[PDB]
Amino acid sequence: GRGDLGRLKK
Amino acid sequence: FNLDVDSPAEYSGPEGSYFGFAVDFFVPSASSRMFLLVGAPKANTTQPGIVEGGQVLKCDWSSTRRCQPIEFDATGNRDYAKDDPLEFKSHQWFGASVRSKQDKILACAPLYHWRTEMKQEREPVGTCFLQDGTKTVEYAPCRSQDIDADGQGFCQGGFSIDFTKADRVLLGGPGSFYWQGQLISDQVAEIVSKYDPNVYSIKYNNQLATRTAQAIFDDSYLGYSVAVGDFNGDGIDDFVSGVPRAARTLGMVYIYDGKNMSSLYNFTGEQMAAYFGFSVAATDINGDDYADVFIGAPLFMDRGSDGKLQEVGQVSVSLQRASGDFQTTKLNGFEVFARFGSAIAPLGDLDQDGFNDIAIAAPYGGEDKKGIVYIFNGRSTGLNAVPSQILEGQWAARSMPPSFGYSMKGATDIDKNGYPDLIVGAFGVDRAILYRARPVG
Amino acid sequence: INTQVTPGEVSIQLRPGAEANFMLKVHPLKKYPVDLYYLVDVSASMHNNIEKLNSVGNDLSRKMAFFSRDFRLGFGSYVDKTVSPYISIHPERIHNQCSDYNLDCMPPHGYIHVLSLTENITEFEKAVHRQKISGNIDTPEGGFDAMLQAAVCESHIGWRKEAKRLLLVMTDQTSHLALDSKLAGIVVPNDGNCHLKNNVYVKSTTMEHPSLGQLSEKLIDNNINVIFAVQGKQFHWYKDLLPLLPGTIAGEIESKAANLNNLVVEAYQKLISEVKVQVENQVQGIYFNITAICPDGSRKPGMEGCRNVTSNDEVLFNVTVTMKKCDNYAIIKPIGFNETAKIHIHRNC
Ligand SMILES: *[C@@H]1O[C@H](CO)[C@@H](O[C@@H]2O[C@H](CO)[C@@H](O[C@@H]3O[C@H](CO[C@H]4O[C@H](CO)[C@@H](O)[C@H](O)[C@@H]4O)[C@@H](O)[C@H](O[C@H]4O[C@H](CO)[C@@H](O)[C@H](O)[C@@H]4O[C@H]4O[C@H](CO)[C@@H](O)[C@H](O)[C@@H]4O)[C@@H]3O)[C@H](O)[C@H]2NC(C)=O)[C@H](O)[C@H]1NC(C)=O
Ligand SMILES: *[C@@H]1O[C@H](CO)[C@@H](O[C@@H]2O[C@H](CO)[C@@H](O)[C@H](O)[C@H]2NC(C)=O)[C@H](O)[C@H]1NC(C)=O
Ligand SMILES: *[C@@H]1O[C@H](CO)[C@@H](O[C@@H]2O[C@H](CO)[C@@H](O)[C@H](O)[C@H]2NC(C)=O)[C@H](O)[C@H]1NC(C)=O
Ligand SMILES: *[C@@H]1O[C@H](CO)[C@@H](O[C@@H]2O[C@H](CO)[C@@H](O)[C@H](O)[C@H]2NC(C)=O)[C@H](O)[C@H]1NC(C)=O
Ligand SMILES: *[C@@H]1O[C@H](CO)[C@@H](O[C@@H]2O[C@H](CO)[C@@H](O)[C@H](O)[C@H]2NC(C)=O)[C@H](O)[C@H]1NC(C)=O
Ligand SMILES: *[C@@H]1O[C@H](CO)[C@@H](O)[C@H](O)[C@H]1NC(C)=O
Ligand SMILES: *[C@@H]1O[C@H](CO)[C@@H](O)[C@H](O)[C@H]1NC(C)=O
Ligand SMILES: *[C@@H]1O[C@H](CO)[C@@H](O)[C@H](O)[C@H]1NC(C)=O
Ligand SMILES: [Ca+2]
Ligand SMILES: [Ca+2]
Ligand SMILES: [Ca+2]
Ligand SMILES: [Ca+2]
Ligand SMILES: [Ca+2]
Ligand SMILES: [Mg+2]
């Protein structure tokens, strides 16, 4: 992921 | 050794405005007069409904120290629709970076935000305004349609700027593509002619810009600082920029060819978190007509006598050679936590040996951490590694440290006595100081 | 007087061009009262990890009963500075940074002190249980700033001077460096002082992160033995900063976070088995040459010290003091120990 919220996005 | 510290001219701005955060010289040369350009990123302006927008001031030298803001923009925020502001010029930090070529003035607002057309956002794209004598034109390359944290939405364009010899602007945005950073260059003639106030995303045909890279390059901060000089021997200034968080925070400095933004040379730091690439400068210091690279690493930690690390800072002096390579010399700081290498201002030939000089600042060094500026002379061998002169900040600390030497500019003979002078900014106390080189015209 | 570092006070005489020397003994004892503070990364990248903190209570206390006279626990959290470009400052995303992804995310904060060091493990378990996730945009997170605030705020966290202070910093990402803060317009150097008002770090939004030298200085000044618990590939980033941060350990959290207690116990064992000193030589014109006579017979350069030390076992530091010139005292302390040797130095010139 990219960014701190990339985990949520993924 | 010949800079006049006895009687330097002093310039002051509004309290808390960060006056002196950026300094430069304005020499239109169509009129014979000379001015100092001082950036005040947190100054209050007369724009309707804008608080701490920022300013760039034009300061006289002739027998007075008065300063007048340059009216780059007098409007408030434009509206995308009814009760729907397009942009947010409050706390935009206008004047954080200022540049002037002959009669042009380029000043930028890195923390300018705007709301994209697609949705209601607040994207720190940053914006620049180019004054070209009679005309004033907005330059906001990083605000566009393809903007997000993924794109140029957080670009903060204009965080660092420079002027190319052949009349191009070099602009670095540390934040684009998840803080991979980016450099953008376009010709001034195209910037001033393609400008339309009603188009929020202007296209530029001959614009050179670096592109997106792998995810491993994220948070590199390409465009943290920029400089220009000829490095591949074709007469066109190349783009030198610092990338302080690259290579796992070792830091890097890239050189891109000015003709096509093609990468030429890479520098890499040798200590993690030292911020190799905070400051970058290019000048020919040894007088062989080849431009030499100066790179600051203000957080560098040096092993002391006992083996204890001391954060003194470092400046890498890299002399260019005809073979297409460099010879690097490390110049360490003199005091702990002074941040030697924060600013690197080439001076030209301060004393006319035939060899250019350079000034390096440690904005938190000296007595009471007032800030100190070190002057180093040039030689046929390279840079004389012993400071020929010391410049000490005079102003005591207010709520924040004076930060004397945080911003500095030289290589201009403002008094027309044949010897280049130097301007130093202390934004912590809202001061700018001019030092005039004494004769050894 | 001193229980571990003897002699605690030394007085010597010197004259220009002369020298002097004495033997310093550092003797670890059998059991230490342990203060362990859990400074956690509560960003949106640690959602799978935070739920596993429920297991570091009772089990960790029973594990550490065998190595400590008594064991304390505390909790604290950080995500980042709450300013652009680090967070989204749109009014919808400003206080619920996971709005687009529809999670019940807490508003972002710089550094919040949740629970002071206490011997009641149930308090720690409950405080851990109720704690939720916050968010921001960029991957690097303000670990170092919260670390400095935890180290320097003695009375707030509850560090005991009699205790073997441990500060565990748990994260999955690199931390922000001092001059990163210029992107937000924060250009005021960190002063290193304490600014916890209502258990919240208020100056996170107005002054930049600390530099590695400043953090190291303030950690060693307070005898904080830092353990880095890092999950992803960013562990090696912290492992590579250990030479720049004396007295710091780094441990790898396994992908499921199943080793978070073995991590602490192993790091504590490594900590108490290493003795290394440094000298606060502020005396003008006098230089120190300290060599560590390790129990195995090695002559290490002192600054690196010796390893695999135990109790019933003393490390000997051979201190040679030279006068080169003239115009006070110097302090030789083993980093991570709660006692120091003060070398008062008289002279005539
Ligand atoms: C100074 O130091 C800097 C930093 O290290 C260095 O810049 C970096 O240079 C490298 C190489 O020039 C860049 O890396 C990539 O290069 C490939 C080239 O592709 C060929 O080689 C690879 C080798 O693995 C093969 O796999 C491939 O098949 C080719 O043979 C480019 O393709 C890369 O760009 C792609 O990826 C980007 C990010 O995903 C995309 O934005 C881009 O459009 C390209 O997309 C393509 O590839 C994707 C891969 O996932 C694919 O998904 C897409 O669909 C599409 O097919 C990239 O350029 C690296 O980016 C540079 N980084 C920076 C910050 O500049 C300098 O070269 C160095 N200079 C000097 C003088 O030393
Ligand atoms: C610019 O002007 C604004 C007011 O238009 C000033 O705002 C003050 O901000 C401080 C906190 O920073 C508040 O305590 C004051 O109450 C505000 N004043 C008013 C009238 O609202 C701001 O300080 C000014 N900034 C500079 C650099 O001059
Ligand atoms: C340790 O803390 C726990 C709670 O964190 C205390 O247990 C609570 O005690 C109160 C009475 O004082 C009860 O009403 C609660 O139901 C208890 N909760 C739990 C979870 O047990 C406990 O008393 C504390 N121990 C000491 C020695 O202070
Ligand atoms: C350094 O730490 C040791 C270990 O805790 C301290 O020794 C204890 O001191 C307390 C009083 O603070 C006594 O009640 C204990 O009996 C001591 N234990 C042992 C094993 O000696 C020591 O006092 C500390 N010294 C300083 C200067 O902080
Ligand atoms: C501790 O250091 C002192 C020096 O400060 C050592 O004493 C010297 O040892 C050398 C080598 O044996 C002799 O040449 C000198 O004459 C000794 N005296 C001085 C004043 O230098 C001493 O041996 C060291 N002790 C240990 C245990 O290593
Ligand atoms: C970029 O321009 C330089 C200078 O003419 C040239 O040597 C180089 O081959 C060019 N590279 C590309 C990719 O166009
Ligand atoms: C310390 O002593 C060593 C010899 O053991 C010598 O090599 C070194 O130069 C000395 N350093 C100082 C600062 O006295
Ligand atoms: C560590 O020290 C103990 C005690 O002297 C000794 O028994 C053991 O062999 C040592 N271990 C190593 C690896 O040197
Ligand atoms: Ca060129
Ligand atoms: Ca040269
Ligand atoms: Ca010269
Ligand atoms: Ca002059
Ligand atoms: Ca972050
Ligand atoms: Mg995170």
Residue numbers in the entry:
A (entry chain E): 240 to 249
B (entry chain A): 1 to 440, 485
C (entry chain B): 72 to 398, 404 to 425
Sentences from the paper on this structure:
Transforming growth factor-β (TGF-β1) is a multifunctional cytokine with key roles in development, immunity, cancer, and fibrosis. The prodomain encircles mature TGF-β homodimer in a ring-shaped disulfide linked homodimer “straitjacket”, (latency-associated peptide, LAP), forming L-TGF-β5.
To test this hypothesis, we determined structures of αvβ8/L-TGF-β3 (2.7Å) and αvβ8/L-TGF-β3/GARP (~ 4.9–7.2Å) using L-TGF-β3 constructs where the furin cleavage site (R277A) was mutated to ensure mature TGF-β3 remained associated with the latent complex. To simplify structural analysis, we focused on αvβ8/L-TGF-β3 without GARP. Further classification reveals L-TGF-β3 rocks over the top of αvβ8 in a much larger range than L-TGF-β1 bound to αvβ822. Indeed, in all conformational snapshots, the L-TGF-β3 straitjacket domains, including mature TGF-β3 peptides, are not resolved. Overall, our structural studies of αvβ8/L-TGF-β3 and αvβ8/L-TGF-β3/GARP reveal similar but more dramatic redistribution of conformational entropy as seen in the αvβ8/L-TGF-β1/GARP, since we could not isolate any subclass with either GARP or complete L-TGF-β3. Thus, we conclude that intrinsic flexibility of L-TGF-β3 is further enhanced upon αvβ8 binding by a similar conformational entropy redistribution mechanism as seen with L-TGF-β1/GARP. Indeed, analysis of supernatant from L-TGF-β3/GARP TMLC cells cultured on immobilized αvβ8 contained significant amounts of released TGF-β as opposed to supernatant from L-TGF-β1/GARP TMLC cells which did not. In contrast, because L-TGF-β3 has higher basal conformational entropy, αvβ8 binding results in more entropy redistribution towards the lasso domain resulting in L-TGF-β3 passing a flexibility threshold sufficient for releasing mature TGF-β3.
